[PDB]
């Protein structure tokens, strides 16, 4: 029941406080009890999300508070209700258990009211589960919060209600692997949780009194405080999460700055003004291009990379171990019998590597030198070793070294000898060195990007912007995402935050849409006919009509039946912009694309990168001592698994020799998996 | 565990050939280290092994004229890779390095449907086979160019699949035009007349004192193929235009987009005349109509002129895709006018119901499960408009041509998406007598959200629940299958099994032929017991049942010629401990008849459990 | 670990030799070595 | 070093007949390779010098839809008989020109029976219009012309007689034209282009000649970027 | 795909042999030089590295040219044990 | 009257600041405007050079993930910055330049606080590079370099001192590149393309100088067409 901390991000170490588990000492998998237990039930409502959960095998067993639950004195959840008499709502507000729930018929959160009184006809209500159209003099509890039926995870993703439950939950999911940009940027559409997230989860500084700043550095800030109080707090700088990525505030105040209790100081690792910064909002055109978005795939404008937008600051720890032994005690050197100096470089400093070098693969982080071979020369290099001068030395090449695939930069090293300053030593182990490896990591053919309403995709391409698809004025698009990734999907949330982007970007707006409540249909395109303006209605002011490609497309608009036929070449364009779809311009030829593309903002985030899912290759190293089957090393990574499952594979294929070799050759054969090198060499 | 092996992530790539793969460079020097190291002695790169290995084991030290003889090793091998789950014959497949930069593996998108792998992120391992009979088998049967075809049906497993389908329909697909309904009057130029001032629109249904024409077809007659495409070129009409061409002294009535096709065949197979006698030049190109194409193009030109015709068809439907340009808007979310209608009188028979049951005659359960059917009926009614809708008003609309093109999405998939997601089932089982009214394009109740989440439950506590293990089918079809290889050519008996051409379902013993898709699948690639002679044609005892024929005798148990078939089986085989090569029938990755020595037992389990995981979990009705 | 019984491994196929036209002559490399006197 | 400046890149052409050519050009920097294959192909599409058929006067119809008494060919198929058919000149004057062809009988018809009027060389030698049989006549006076692209006939006005009709203008004598763009390598740049492009032509012009123009009519538009006149830009208006 | 591949296997009775052949076949190949080549000097396979055609390396991919010309003859019986473990060394150097 | 060639056009500018510049090009034949217009934006966005800065040394920090005392700004943030600083060099054959800045004390260090350089204009001097605090002090060097496309630090060393930063160097000083193509009529003729490249940059180039180089280079590119060779 007791794990390693999630913090991947502010939310992520959020998410994990408010986990609940049916196993650990309660019956467990092995028992399932599937289909019960794991199916989300009537008694859930405000008590669990219903839509957020582990994939696969631990499925409904692990779960996830619903935001306004609450755990009485005894251990029962709670979801609050406001009490209404006679159709008259008050804000009296009561949290019942489940079991009191079921003696009442709650009505739903979205009845419409005249003041504190109820303007409906037939009221929408529960009834202990059962929804019925009711009429006010029955009611007599209501729904708080269209909120309080879903965890915080889920309550992040705009238009909630347009998002099939299954791609949403994904959603709520990878909210966990949002990694803190360099330029974490909140999203141009919000829920109103963002705010209250990065407060409640101590992702900022906040200031808990009134007063003038005093201090403002990089490291840290003093204010003092209208009763007197000069206190200092530091500005916990470039720490390192569980996960690697990077915790750590930035100040958002100036040098004697007046201030008020609660205000920001310091921004969080993943906030933007104390609101939760987990991704960024880029311009996107939805649309096929050439097949490098061919299955979820995604293309990236390389203009991405130089804004340092989807950059990501990640810290690394290594160690190394000074053991006794029974050949005798082992060293940190830096002295390394080898046959370079100039590969030496960077490392003088008497063993450890100086605090701001260059790493790559292979290079030398901490050197190290210990006995082995049971203190004689090989018959061979005994008569090797004397011809150079036989020193042999009795020492060997055991340095930590940089492990393939990818280090970075150095920037802080810890040498512990002896634990006599108050560090618990290791039984048999003299001292440890650490040593701790920074790398920006832009992004890249392979990262992984996502967005709240569930889609995930990778980097499939990284074009230049010379080939974009872009607007009349200019502006070419971001990223560029396969429409066949939806229909199936049923997620169009992703389609309502487009949409709402395309206007905010030129209304230069943000919204706040609440999660069923929020923006309609109507106003949308009403402010898409704001924005309309902004975009178009000083596209002529500047001397430009409209194009000879404008002319070819809304022919074929006005067929596809998206526009009137009759009305103004110009106001055709309006109706279409509306729609969200505008016309934009194969970078490449510089032609139209045939009917119209809906471009707009949307908000997304680059998904963490795991170690599992790390790229590996074995050409061959380190055998298992018992089974003599290959194993990892911490240079060498092992072998891949070759079940029963993939055996069948070629035997089905008449694979012979093939499938022998990788169930000889290649794994157990001692014998010949040397006679093989050795031919191969 | 395997010692010349590797993995990654995989990013799409569509340039890429169908038997190639994009590679890191990165991941290939670790594993063809050894064979490298001597080209590196075999070139200056190095004295000798030791110096060779010790110029690579600290990365900056490589020097770069190093994978100048990477690439040089490579040339010829092969790798493979396999995906998890490897649950048939096709989760391993052999494919050319392309050495690639940057820590991904780029993968050609055709054996995407096979290894049935998407890119938000599965990963791919990569094993190297070592010995030069390992490569031996690994070109000549594993590479992906030569396993088109698929092992459980018959049917080509390399198929256009998405963006490569939305692509080629756009293009071939001919357009319907309103404005100017059915007219009746003289020719001359008194036709175009009306187009001139534009009464008649120029793709419109229309028929004058003659025939049935465009205007369409009068107004644009062009000579040759090219003469066509140089007039959609300078934008005078497209490829979806209606129009009349000539060609090989035909005169025809398609439109360019057609032809265009007709021609991206014709050329990367060739032969135009193999070529244009297989193209269904009638309807537009989908996701059956292509399956077919393949198909014949692998049995009337070999499997080596077949590979470049995937990669052509392939190279088309994206391109064309992007410039086609479709998308999807909210307001390509078509919702028809009737649901409305429809929910009234849904509405008002609840109503009745409601009334029947306050009343007296009918019992709890007689009223529940009337409810039901209603809806059953409705949420059908709302599915049919929401289509015709789509035909007769937007018939260019995005969701409606992926649904149609079988380039994505189903009907009950669009339904909840304009028309109405509908009865909802409780987490006990038994459905809510109230469905979810809304769709997604209106957006759900707070409390239409919550029903809809206990069987999205249970559509999850269903495929994790084989996702843990449902390799367990084809370990257990394995275990009793195995032994059995193809040993004998012909096992030498007399006897046999008849395959029925008639159902006896329309019950009881009604009698009416089964599905073609039925016989196809006892039939396909049999071997004659029996000489079958049936519509003025011999099909002589011990012949090999060419698909043509499958569809022969059909065409005799329609004709009311035929209504067994005196097949031969492995249900009859006579081969100490395995099945003659007669006895089985075609290999069905090709069409030619099995070669001996096939791991046919084998084949025969995975074929049967690599679609379990997608037969619904448990009674649900 | 043996070979598998089947595909190339299948004692039908496996035992297929080859040979050259020129080395078809060690046909004849054996045929006039015989008969003394 | 890291490195310098671009290597001169390799214009590859093997040559095939009159009608069809291939232009392989490597290597080119990243882009590049599309940069110069629209406006190239474009230009290969709309301007080269062409020469076509825009009114053709009629012996035996006053309405374009009869088969004309004694051929079995229609008057559509017939017109169409002419947009195959290629016309090349050796006179800088010409910008119109009118010729004539006489048969009737049981003969063959071909191209040669139009008189070579001027300095009009006409390329095709045995092409086919149509076929006679009794004593059905006809003789024609079809206009040609001087020009460039393709032009609908209801988009052209000012006809030849009131015996003839306005027709469709197949200028360009380019008919089709292709260019697949392709990564190439250069030792240690896989990021570069190589631009193979393919032309068809009518056998007027050659392809290479086609091809060489164009690059031209690009080289000789690009100098229309000289004399520059100034004016103010626009209004703040907030 | 890989060359004539339709054509080669129609050489065999069955998939298996020409897989079993072209392997052998390759093993011999590569085994003295490429000494053995049934196959002209201008039919040899190449690169195109440094700039310059060399020929290529991949055993596997000669046999299959070689077989393809029809040069080379297979069957289940054609000569004793190691008794072709000397003809092949002497006419074509076995160092 | 050779009916069937055409007549030299107009072409005409419309400059504003360093960073502005509209080019039409009244009458183009039907096509002509994406014909031309385009491939020049290609070229004009990717391949027309300029100057950026490579490498950053600071008194006493020795790599990016670094806080200087008495400095809000972090390493990675002042960077940031002076990824924006945009430079002249007015001499075509000038390489490289280090520009440098000491400052102590109360003050917001601005892109003017750099030491002059002789034929080197400061294009932006009051972009914001840090703000320092009581007892703050940050001296530092910053290496710049006439350069093309985007050079990013992983594919240069650089390293002018051993505790240099190489930075993220985006060259092109074309910061955005549209071409309206609408229509004009010649009384006659009535479908004529209206060019009209309009180039905004970054004050390093003049769209005019960006527009002639681009031109030029499509010429210069024009060149390899002659002088055949088969295959
Ligand atoms: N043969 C086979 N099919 C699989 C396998 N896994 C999934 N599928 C099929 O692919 C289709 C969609 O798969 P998903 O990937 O889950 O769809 P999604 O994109 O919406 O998540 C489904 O049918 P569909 O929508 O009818 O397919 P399609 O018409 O989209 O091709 C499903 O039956 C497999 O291992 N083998
Ligand atoms: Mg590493
Ligand atoms: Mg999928
Ligand atoms: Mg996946
Ligand atoms: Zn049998």
């Given amino acids: 029941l007791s794990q390693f901390k999630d913090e991947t991000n502010p939310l992520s170490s959020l998410r994990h406080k408010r986990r609940i588990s049916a196993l650990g000492p309660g019956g467990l998998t092995r028992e399932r009890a599937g289909f019960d237990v794991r199916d989300v039930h009537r008694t859930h409502y405000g008590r669990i999300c219903p839509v957020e959960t582990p994939e696969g095998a631990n499925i409904g067993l692990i779960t996830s508070l619903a935001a306004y639950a609450r755990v009485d004195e005894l251990g029962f959840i709670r979801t609050p209700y406001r009490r209404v008499v006679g159709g008259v709502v008050t804000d009296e507000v009561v949290y019942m258990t489940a079991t009191e729930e079921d003696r009442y018929t709650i009505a739903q959160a979205n009845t419409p009211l005249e003041g504190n009184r109820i303007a409906a006809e037939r009221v929408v209500a529960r009834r202990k589960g059962e929804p019925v159209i009711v009429s006010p003099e029955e009611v007599e509890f209501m729904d708080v919060s269209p909120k309080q039926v879903f965890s915080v995870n889920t309550n992040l993703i705009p238009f909630l209600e347009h998002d099939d439950a299954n791609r949403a939950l994904m959603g709520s999911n990878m909210q966990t692997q949002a990694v803190p940009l360099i330029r974490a940027q909140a999203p141009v559409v919000m829920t109103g949780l963002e705010e209250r997230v990065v407060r409640d989860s101590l992702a900022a500084l906040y200031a808990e009194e009134d007063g003038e700043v005093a201090k403002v550095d990089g490291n840290r800030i003093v204010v003092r405080y209208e009763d007197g109080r000069l206190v200092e707090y530091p500005l916990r700088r470039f720490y390192r999460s569980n996960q690697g990525t990077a915790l750590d505030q930035r100040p958002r105040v100036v040098v004697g700055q007046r201030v008020r209790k609660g205000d920001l100081l310091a921004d969080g690792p993943a906030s933007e003004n104390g609101f939760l910064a987990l991704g960024q909002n880029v311009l996107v055109a939805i649309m096929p291009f050439d097949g490098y978005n061919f299955e979820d795939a995604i293309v990236i404008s390389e203009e991405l990379l130089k804004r340092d937008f989807y950059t990501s600051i990640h810290i690394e720890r290594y160690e190394i171990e000074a053991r006794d032994t029974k050949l005798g005690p082992e060293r940190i050197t830096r002295d390394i019998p080898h046959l370079s100096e100039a590969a030496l470089r960077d490392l003088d400093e008497e063993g450890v590597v100086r605090i701001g070098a260059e790493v790559k693969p292979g290079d030398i982080l901490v050197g190290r030198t210990s006995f082995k071979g049971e203190s004689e020369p090989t018959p061979e290099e005994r008569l090797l070793r004397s011809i150079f001068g036989e020193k042999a030395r009795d020492v060997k090449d055991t340095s930590l070294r940089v492990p393939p695939g990818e280090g970075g930069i150095v920037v802080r090293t810890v040498r512990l000898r002896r634990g006599d300053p108050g560090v618990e030593l290791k039984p048999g182990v003299r001292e440890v060195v650490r040593v701790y490896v920074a790398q920006k990591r832009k992004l890249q053919v392979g990262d992984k990007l996502a967005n709240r309403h569930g889609n995930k995709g990778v980097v499939a391409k990284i074009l230049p912007v010379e080939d974009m698809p872009h607007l009349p004025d200019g502006t070419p698009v971001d990223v560029i995402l396969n429409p066949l990734g939806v229909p199936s999907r049923m997620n169009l949330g992703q389609i309502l935050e487009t949409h709402l982007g395309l206007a905010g970007y030129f209304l230069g707006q943000r919204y706040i849409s609440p999660i069923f409540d929020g923006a309609k249909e109507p106003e949308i395109k009403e402010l898409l006919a704001q924005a309309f303006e902004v975009y178009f209605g000083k596209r002529k002011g500047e001397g430009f009509g409209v194009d000879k490609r404008e002319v070819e497309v809304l022919r074929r608009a006005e067929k596809l039946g998206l526009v009137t036929p009759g009305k103004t070449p110009e106001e055709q364009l309006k109706e279409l912009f509306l729609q969200g779809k505008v016309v934009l311009y194969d970078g490449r030829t510089g032609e139209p694309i045939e009917g119209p593309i809906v471009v707009g903002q949307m908000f997304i985030m680059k998904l963490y990168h795991m170690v599992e899912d790390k790229m590996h290759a074995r050409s061959t190293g380190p055998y298992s001592l018992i089974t003599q089957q290959p194993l990892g090393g911490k240079a060498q990574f092992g072998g891949q698994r070759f079940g029963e499952m993939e055996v069948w594979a070629l035997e089905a294929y008449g694979a012979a020799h093939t499938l022998q070799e990788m169930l000889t050759l290649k794994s157990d054969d001692i014998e010949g998996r040397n006679a093989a090198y050795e031919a191969i060499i | 565990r395997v010692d010349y092996s590797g993995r990654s992530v995989i990013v799409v790539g569509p340039q890429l050939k169908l038997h190639q793969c994009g590679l890191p460079k990165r991941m290939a020097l670790e594993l063809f280290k050894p064979f490298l190291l001597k080209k590196m002695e075999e070139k200056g790169i190095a004295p000798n092994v030791k110096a060779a290995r010790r110029m690579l084991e600290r990365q900056r030290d490589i020097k770069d004229e190093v994978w100048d003889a990477l690439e040089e090793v490579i040339h010829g091998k092969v790798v493979l890779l396999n995906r998890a789950p490897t649950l048939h014959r096709l989760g391993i497949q052999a494919f050319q390095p392309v050495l690639v930069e940057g820590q991904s593996i780029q993968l050609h998108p055709l054996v995407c449907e096979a290894f049935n792998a998407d890119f938000d992120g599965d990963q791919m391992a990569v094993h190297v086979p070592l010995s030069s009979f390992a490569q031996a088998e690994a070109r000549i049967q594993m590479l992906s160019a030569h396993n088109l075809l698929s092992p459980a049906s018959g049917e080509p497993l390399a198929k256009p699949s998405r963006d490569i389908i939305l692509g080629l329909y756009y293009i071939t697909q001919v357009r319907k035009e309103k404005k100017g309904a059915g007219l009746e009057f003289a020719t001359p130029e008194e036709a175009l007349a009306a187009h001139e001032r534009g009464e008649v629109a120029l793709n419109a249904p229309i028929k004058?004192?003659?025939?049935?024409?465009?205007?369409?077809?009068?107004?644009?007659?062009?000579?040759?193929?090219?003469?066509?495409?140089?007039?959609?070129?300078?934008?005078?009409?497209?490829?979806?235009?209606?129009?009349?061409?000539?060609?090989?002294?035909?005169?025809?009535?398609?439109?360019?987009?057609?032809?265009?096709?007709?021609?991206?065949?014709?050329?990367?197979?060739?032969?135009?005349?193999?070529?244009?006698?297989?193209?269904?030049?009638?309807?537009?190109?989908?996701?059956?109509?292509?399956?077919?194409?393949?198909?014949?193009?692998?049995?009337?030109?070999?499997?080596?002129?077949?590979?470049?015709?995937?990669?052509?068809?392939?190279?088309?439907?994206?391109?064309?895709?992007?410039?086609?340009?479709?998308?999807?808007?909210?307001?390509?979310?078509?919702?028809?006018?009737?649901?409305?209608?429809?929910?009234?009188?849904?509405?008002?028979?609840?109503?009745?119901?409601?009334?029947?049951?306050?009343?007296?005659?009918?019992?709890?359960?007689?009223?529940?499960?009337?409810?039901?059917?209603?809806?059953?009926?409705?949420?059908?009614?709302?599915?049919?408009?929401?289509?015709?809708?789509?035909?007769?008003?937007?018939?260019?609309?995005?969701?409606?041509?992926?649904?149609?093109?079988?380039?994505?999405?189903?009907?009950?998939?669009?339904?909840?998406?304009?028309?109405?997601?509908?009865?909802?089932?409780?987490?006990?089982?038994?459905?809510?007598?109230?469905?979810?009214?809304?769709?997604?394009?209106?957006?759900?109740?707070?409390?239409?959200?919550?029903?809809?989440?206990?069987?999205?439950?249970?559509?999850?506590?269903?495929?994790?629940?084989?996702?843990?293990?449902?390799?367990?089918?084809?370990?257990?079809?394995?275990?009793?299958?195995?032994?059995?290889?193809?040993?004998?050519?012909?096992?030498?008996?007399?006897?046999?099994?008849?395959?029925?051409?008639?159902?006896?379902?329309?019950?009881?013993?009604?009698?009416?032929?089964?599905?073609?898709?039925?016989?196809?699948?006892?039939?396909?690639?049999?071997?004659?017991?029996?000489?079958?002679?049936?519509?003025?044609?011999?099909?002589?005892?011990?012949?090999?049942?060419?698909?043509?024929?499958?569809?022969?005798?059909?065409?005799?148990?329609?004709?009311?010629?035929?209504?067994?078939?005196?097949?031969?089986?492995?249900?009859?085989?006579?081969?100490?401990?395995?099945?003659?090569?007669?006895?089985?029938?075609?290999?069905?990755?090709?069409?030619?008849?099995?070669?001996?020595?096939?791991?046919?037992?084998?084949?025969?389990?995975?074929?049967?459990?690599?679609?379990?995981?997608?037969?619904?979990?448990?009674?649900?009705? | 670990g043996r070979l598998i019984p089947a595909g190339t491994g299948s004692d039908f196929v496996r035992f297929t030799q080859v040979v050259d036209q020129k080395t078809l002559k060690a046909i004849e490399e054996a045929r006039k070595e015989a008969v003394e006197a | 070093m890291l490195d310098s400046k671009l290597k001169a890149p390799v214009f590859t052409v093997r040559t095939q007949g009159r009608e069809y050519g291939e232009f392989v050009l490597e290597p080119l920097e990243r882009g590049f390779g599309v940069t110069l294959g629209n406006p190239l192909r474009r230009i290969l599409l709309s301007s080269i010098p062409g020469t076509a058929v825009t009114s053709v006067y009629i012996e035996d119809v006053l309405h374009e839809f009869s088969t004309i008494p004694g051929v079995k060919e229609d008057v559509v198929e017939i017109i169409l008989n002419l947009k195959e058919l290629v016309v090349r000149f050796l006179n800088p004057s010409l910008q119109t020109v009118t010729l004539l062809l006489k048969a009737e009988g049981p003969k063959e018809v071909k191209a040669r029976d139009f008189l070579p009027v001027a300095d009009v060389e006409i390329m095709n030698p045995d092409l086919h219009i149509a076929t006679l049989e009794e004593g059905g006549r006809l003789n024609m006076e079809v206009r040609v012309d001087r020009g460039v692209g393709y032009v609908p006939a209801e988009k052209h006005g000012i006809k030849d007689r009131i015996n003839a009709i306005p027709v469709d203008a197949v200028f360009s004598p380019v008919r089709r034209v292709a260019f697949q763009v392709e990564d190439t390598r250069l030792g240690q740049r896989t990021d570069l282009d190589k631009l193979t492009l393919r032309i068809w032509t009518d056998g007027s012009v050659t392809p290479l000649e086609a091809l060489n123009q164009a690059v031209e009519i690009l080289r000789e538009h690009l100098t229309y970027f000289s004399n520059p006149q100034a004016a103010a830009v626009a209004a703040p208006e907030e | 795909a890989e060359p004539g591949i339709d054509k080669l296997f129609g050489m065999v009775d069955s998939k298996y042999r020409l897989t079993v052949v072209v392997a052998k076949r390759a093993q011999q190949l590569l085994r003295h030089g490429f000494k053995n080549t049934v196959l002209e000097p201008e039919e040899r396979p190449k690169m195109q590295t440094l700039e310059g055609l060399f020929d290529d390396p991949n055993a596997e991919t000669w046999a299959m040219k070689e077989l393809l010309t029809g040069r080379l003859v297979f069957g289940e019986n054609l000569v004793p044990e190691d008794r072709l473990q000397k003809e092949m060394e002497r006419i074509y150097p076995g160092e």
């Fill in chain 2, 208 to 621: 004058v004192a003659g025939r049935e024409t465009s205007v369409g077809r009068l107004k644009y007659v062009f000579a040759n193929p090219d003469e066509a495409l140089l007039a959609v070129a300078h934008g005078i009409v497209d490829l979806q235009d209606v129009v009349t061409v000539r060609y090989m002294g035909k005169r025809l009535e398609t439109s360019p987009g057609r032809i265009l096709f007709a021609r991206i065949v014709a050329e990367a197979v060739e032969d135009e005349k193999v070529a244009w006698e297989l193209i269904q030049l009638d309807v537009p190109q989908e996701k059956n109509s292509l399956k077919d194409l393949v198909y014949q193009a692998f049995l009337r030109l070999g499997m080596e002129k077949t590979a470049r015709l995937l990669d052509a068809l392939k190279y088309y439907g994206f391109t064309f895709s992007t410039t086609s340009g479709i998308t999807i808007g909210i307001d390509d979310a078509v919702i028809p006018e009737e649901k409305k209608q429809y929910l009234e009188e849904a509405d008002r028979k609840l109503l009745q119901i409601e009334q029947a049951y306050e009343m007296g005659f009918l019992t709890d359960r007689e009223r529940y499960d009337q409810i039901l059917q209603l809806w059953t009926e409705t949420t059908e009614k709302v599915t049919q408009a929401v289509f015709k809708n789509f035909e007769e008003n937007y018939p260019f609309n995005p969701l409606y041509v992926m649904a149609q093109s079988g380039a994505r999405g189903n009907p009950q998939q669009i339904r909840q998406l304009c028309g109405l997601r509908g009865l909802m089932q409780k987490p006990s089982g038994e459905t809510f007598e109230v469905p979810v009214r809304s769709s997604f394009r209106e957006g759900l109740t707070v409390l239409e959200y919550f029903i809809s989440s206990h069987g999205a439950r249970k559509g999850g506590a269903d495929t994790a629940l084989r996702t843990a293990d449902s390799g367990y089918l084809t370990r257990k079809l394995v275990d009793v299958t195995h032994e059995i290889v193809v040993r004998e050519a012909d096992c030498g008996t007399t006897n046999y099994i008849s395959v029925p051409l008639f159902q006896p379902d329309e019950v009881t013993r009604s009698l009416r032929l089964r599905k073609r898709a039925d016989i196809e699948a006892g039939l396909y690639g049999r071997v004659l017991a029996r000489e079958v002679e049936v519509l003025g044609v011999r099909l002589e005892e011990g012949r090999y049942l060419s698909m043509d024929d499958v569809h022969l005798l059909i065409k005799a148990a329609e004709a009311g010629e035929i209504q067994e078939v005196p097949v031969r089986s492995p249900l009859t085989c006579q081969t100490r401990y395995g099945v003659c090569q007669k006895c089985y029938g075609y290999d069905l990755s090709m069409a030619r008849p099995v070669s001996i020595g096939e791991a046919v037992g084998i084949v025969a389990a995975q074929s049967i459990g690599e679609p379990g995981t997608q037969l619904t979990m448990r009674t649900f009705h």
